[PDB]
Design an enzyme around this catalytic site. Structure first.
Site, mmCIF file in Angstrom:
data_model
loop_
_atom_site.group_PDB
_atom_site.id
_atom_site.type_symbol
_atom_site.label_atom_id
_atom_site.label_comp_id
_atom_site.label_asym_id
_atom_site.label_seq_id
_atom_site.Cartn_x
_atom_site.Cartn_y
_atom_site.Cartn_z
ATOM 1 N N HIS A 1 -55.497 -68.982 -65.254
ATOM 2 C CA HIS A 1 -56.336 -68.827 -64.074
ATOM 3 C C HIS A 1 -56.159 -67.488 -63.368
ATOM 4 C CE1 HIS A 1 -52.701 -70.170 -61.909
ATOM 5 N NE2 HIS A 1 -53.267 -69.737 -60.798
ATOM 6 N N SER B 1 -48.252 -67.880 -59.098
ATOM 7 C CA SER B 1 -48.906 -68.317 -60.332
ATOM 8 C C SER B 1 -48.618 -67.447 -61.550
ATOM 9 C CB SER B 1 -50.422 -68.378 -60.142
ATOM 10 O OG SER B 1 -50.791 -69.404 -59.251
HETATM 11 C C1 LIG Z 1 -61.637 -78.243 -58.789
HETATM 12 N N1 LIG Z 1 -60.642 -77.185 -59.100
HETATM 13 C C2 LIG Z 1 -61.219 -75.936 -58.558
HETATM 14 C C3 LIG Z 1 -59.187 -77.393 -58.774
HETATM 15 C C4 LIG Z 1 -58.173 -78.289 -59.597
HETATM 16 C C5 LIG Z 1 -58.722 -79.073 -60.714
HETATM 17 C C6 LIG Z 1 -57.881 -80.007 -61.470
HETATM 18 C C7 LIG Z 1 -56.463 -80.107 -61.053
HETATM 19 C C8 LIG Z 1 -55.881 -79.326 -59.954
HETATM 20 C C9 LIG Z 1 -56.727 -78.375 -59.207
HETATM 21 C C10 LIG Z 1 -56.046 -77.488 -58.155
HETATM 22 C C11 LIG Z 1 -55.975 -76.014 -58.391
HETATM 23 C C12 LIG Z 1 -55.427 -75.115 -57.378
HETATM 24 C C13 LIG Z 1 -54.933 -75.693 -56.096
HETATM 25 N N2 LIG Z 1 -54.447 -74.869 -55.076
HETATM 26 C C14 LIG Z 1 -55.245 -74.484 -53.897
HETATM 27 C C15 LIG Z 1 -54.413 -74.357 -52.630
HETATM 28 C C16 LIG Z 1 -53.153 -73.565 -52.931
HETATM 29 C C17 LIG Z 1 -52.308 -72.800 -52.102
HETATM 30 C C18 LIG Z 1 -52.661 -72.408 -50.673
HETATM 31 F F1 LIG Z 1 -51.756 -71.558 -50.237
HETATM 32 F F2 LIG Z 1 -53.860 -71.854 -50.588
HETATM 33 F F3 LIG Z 1 -52.615 -73.501 -49.981
HETATM 34 N N3 LIG Z 1 -51.238 -72.465 -52.864
HETATM 35 N N4 LIG Z 1 -51.374 -72.975 -54.145
HETATM 36 C C19 LIG Z 1 -50.354 -72.948 -55.113
HETATM 37 C C20 LIG Z 1 -50.318 -71.926 -56.171
HETATM 38 C C21 LIG Z 1 -49.259 -71.874 -57.189
HETATM 39 C C22 LIG Z 1 -48.194 -72.857 -57.180
HETATM 40 C C23 LIG Z 1 -48.226 -73.867 -56.131
HETATM 41 C C24 LIG Z 1 -47.126 -74.826 -56.037
HETATM 42 N N5 LIG Z 1 -47.152 -75.523 -54.967
HETATM 43 O O1 LIG Z 1 -46.032 -75.065 -56.978
HETATM 44 C C25 LIG Z 1 -49.281 -73.943 -55.100
HETATM 45 C C26 LIG Z 1 -52.582 -73.639 -54.207
HETATM 46 C C27 LIG Z 1 -53.239 -74.283 -55.294
HETATM 47 O O2 LIG Z 1 -52.766 -74.333 -56.437
HETATM 48 C C28 LIG Z 1 -54.915 -77.162 -55.890
HETATM 49 C C29 LIG Z 1 -55.464 -78.055 -56.909
#
Ligand SMILES: CN(C)Cc1ccccc1-c1ccc(N2CCc3c(C(F)(F)F)nn(-c4cccc(C(N)=O)c4)c3C2=O)cc1
Lengths: 234, 52
Positions: free
Chosen positions: A42, A185
């Site tokens: 991603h 990431s």
């Molecule tokens: C329909 N699609 C678009 C989605 C989707 C589909 C299927 C399955 C899952 C998902 C999904 C993909 C990405 C996220 N988000 C968005 C919010 C976010 C934030 C912040 F700061 F913005 F809040 N930080 N962060 C982040 C980045 C790297 C590591 C971790 C961790 N906490 O170890 C957290 C995320 C993050 O990953 C949530 C869910």
């Protein structure tokens, strides 16, 4: 990284950093060898043209150990979709080979079977990066690291709002405000075994950062070891 | 228990062949003569924090 500790001199030599056109870090990666970087798929959506900086620990100072590397070949996993975030892996072949030095060294790639029964059965792992220190904060200028406990597959699938496939695993804290975060990431999740660190995961995604009853979702490296071997024969 | 018991006394990988413990290493490491330890063949072997 939210919480966790700053990486001290030579503690995270396998950390790589993907930098865009404004020389800004947008994602991380792990050094696999002098020519290969492991990161998340991603992230290859997070920037037009980018390079790879290694040996950096403080993105602010011209330390001297940093070395920028241009990508010769990008190998993104063909089964990756932002729809599911499954198969969130990619290998990068560098135009020039990395010269290992202080703060610059690869992590070991383990064997599938051994890693699954000996490494991922361990209590914790270690995630590092220049990502946000707060869910709403800005990217870090200092490389951080956090020891995150392995979460059993069922407790995590239940805590998630999204389908946790077999290509991913959970790591983190339910309550405790420590966790990876945006910007981390593609970064390294390693498991130490007798002083030697092995790459066990790839920072992938999470519902926010450090939230109660939520954990970090990582790409399971053991699930792509052969894919990784094939990719490094480029 | 073989490998189930303290990694079979191996430094790194361990597998049970012929109902016995067989140790191996990551690339850049060579197995010792005791056939358990792994010896880095370079200055910056993989998985080792650089402390100089
Ligand atoms: C329909 N699609 C678009 C989605 C989707 C589909 C299927 C399955 C899952 C998902 C999904 C993909 C990405 C996220 N988000 C968005 C919010 C976010 C934030 C912040 F700061 F913005 F809040 N930080 N962060 C982040 C980045 C790297 C590591 C971790 C961790 N906490 O170890 C957290 C995320 C993050 O990953 C949530 C869910």
């Amino acid at each position: 990284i939210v919480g966790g500790q700053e990486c001290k001199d030579g503690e995270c030599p396998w950390q790589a950093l993907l930098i865009n056109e404004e020389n800004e870090g947008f994602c991380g990666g792990t050094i696999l060898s002098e020519f290969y970087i492991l990161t998340a798929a991603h992230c290859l959506y997070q920037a037009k043209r980018f390079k790879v900086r290694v040996g950096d620990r403080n993105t602010e100072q011209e330390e001297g150990g940093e070395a920028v590397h241009e990508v010769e070949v990008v190998i993104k996993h063909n089964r990756f979709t932002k729809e599911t975030y499954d198969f969130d892996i990619a290998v990068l072949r560098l135009k020039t080979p990395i010269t290992f030095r202080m703060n610059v060294a690869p992590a070991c790639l383990p064997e599938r079977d051994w890693a699954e029964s000996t490494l991922m059965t361990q209590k914790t792992g270690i995630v590092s990066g220049f990502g946000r220190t707060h869910e709403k904060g800005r990217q870090s200028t200092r490389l951080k690291m956090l020891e995150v406990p392995y979460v059993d597959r069922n407790s995590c699938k239940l805590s998630s709002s999204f389908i946790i496939t077999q290509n991913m695993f959970c790591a983190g804290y339910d309550t405790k405000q420590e966790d990876a975060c945006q910007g981390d990431s593609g970064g390294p999740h390693v498991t130490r075994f007798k002083d030697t660190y092995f790459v066990t995961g790839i920072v992938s995604w999470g519902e926010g950062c450090a939230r109660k009853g939520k954990y970090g979702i990582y790409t399971k490296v053991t699930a792509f070891l052969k894919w990784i071997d094939r990719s490094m024969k480029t | 228990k073989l490998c189930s018991l303290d990694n079979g006394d191996c430094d790194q990988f361990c597998h049970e062949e012929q109902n016995s413990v067989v140790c191996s290493c990551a690339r850049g490491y060579t197995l010792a003569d005791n056939g358990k330890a792994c010896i880095p063949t370079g200055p910056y072997p993989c998985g080792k924090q650089t402390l100089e």
